Structure 1
C-alpha cells in the first residue's frame, strides 16, 4: 500500500522508478496483488532480499472465477529480466502440472522466455497468465 512505502522496499533496485511505476500499474488493475519484501534463498543456498507480488488473479473457468494465488519475484534488475513466477496452491488446491506449470509450481510462458523490457512488463505478463490459465487451469479444487 502507499506509493512511498513501495519506493522504500525497492530502494536497493538498480531501476527503482521503472519497477515502481510498473508495480503501481499492476496493483492498480489487480488490487488482489500486493508488494512485499522478503528474502529469496536460491537453490545454491544464497539469499537476497527481493520484492515480489503476492496475491491472487481472476481466471474465469467454466463460468466460475478462480482466484489462483501467485508470487512474482523481481531481481535487483527486473526491468530487463523476467520475474520468477510461482503457483502457491492452498491446502484445498492441487497443482495440475501442464505446459505452463510443473510440480513445484513454476510457471512457464513464452512471455518469460522472450522477455525484453521495452515492451514486456508485469501487467502484460499477468494478462497473459490469465489467458493461458483460462484455457489451461494449473490447479483444480
Structure 2
C-alpha cells in the first residue's frame, strides 16, 4: 500500500497517470491481488525516471489443485510503448519453463499483444488470457 496521496505522488510524473490510475484501480478492483509498486531506473548512462510495476499472484488451478503464479507488469508515461509490458517474474525456489508466450525472459509473446490495438485489447484480458493459458499449462514449472 501507499495511500492515494502517496500513490499518485509516485505516478505524478506519469503523463497518462489519470489513465494509469484508472487502469490500476480497475486491475485491482477486478483482482485484489495485483499490488501497485514503484521502481525507478537510470537511462542511457545517467538519466533516470520513475516507472510503476504491478506485482501480484493469480490462482492457477490444475488437475483440481491450486497454484500461485506471480506476474509483474511495467508501466510508462507515454513512451516508448504507450501500452505497458507484461512479463512473468521467476522465483528462486521455482523455475520458469517458458510457455506458449512466456519467453525465456518471462515476457508474454502473445500474438494478441504484439497486435494489441486498443481498446480492442486491455489489461483485464491480458490477465484473463493468462488465467487460461496458465490455467491449462503452467509456464513456471519446476520439475527437473
- TM-score if structure 2 supplies the norm length? 0.81
For residues 88 and 79 of structure 2, what CA distance do their matches in structure 1 show? 19
SS of equivalent residue, structure 1 residue 85: strand
- What root-mean-square deviation, in Å, do the aligned CA atoms of Structure 1 and Structure 2 show? 2.7
Larger Rg: 2
For residues 131 and 104 of structure 1, what CA distance do their matches in structure 2 show? 20
CA drift at 1:97: 1.8
Gaps of 5+ in 1: none
Task: Go from structure 1 to structure 2 and tell me whether the alpha carbon gap of 1:67 and 1:108 turns closer, same or farther (over 3 Å shift).
Answer: same
Gaps of 5+ in 2: none
How many residue pairs get matched?
141
For residues 44 and 114 of structure 1, what CA distance do their matches in structure 2 show? 31
1:127 corresponds to: 128
Task: Go from structure 1 to structure 2 and tell me whether the alpha carbon gap of 1:47 and 1:130 turns closer, same or farther (over 3 Å shift).
Answer: farther
CA drift at 1:78: 7.6
Report Cα offsets for 1:30-87 as digits up to 9, x if no partner. Answer: 2221111102457989753211101111222221121111110011128973322222
- TM-score if structure 1 supplies the norm length? 0.83
SS of equivalent residue, structure 1 residue 39: strand
Task: Go from structure 1 to structure 2 and tell me whether the alpha carbon gap of 1:45 and 1:124 turns closer, same or farther (over 3 Å shift).
Answer: farther
Report Cα offsets for 1:7-31 as digits up to 9, x if no partner. Answer: 2221122211121111001111222
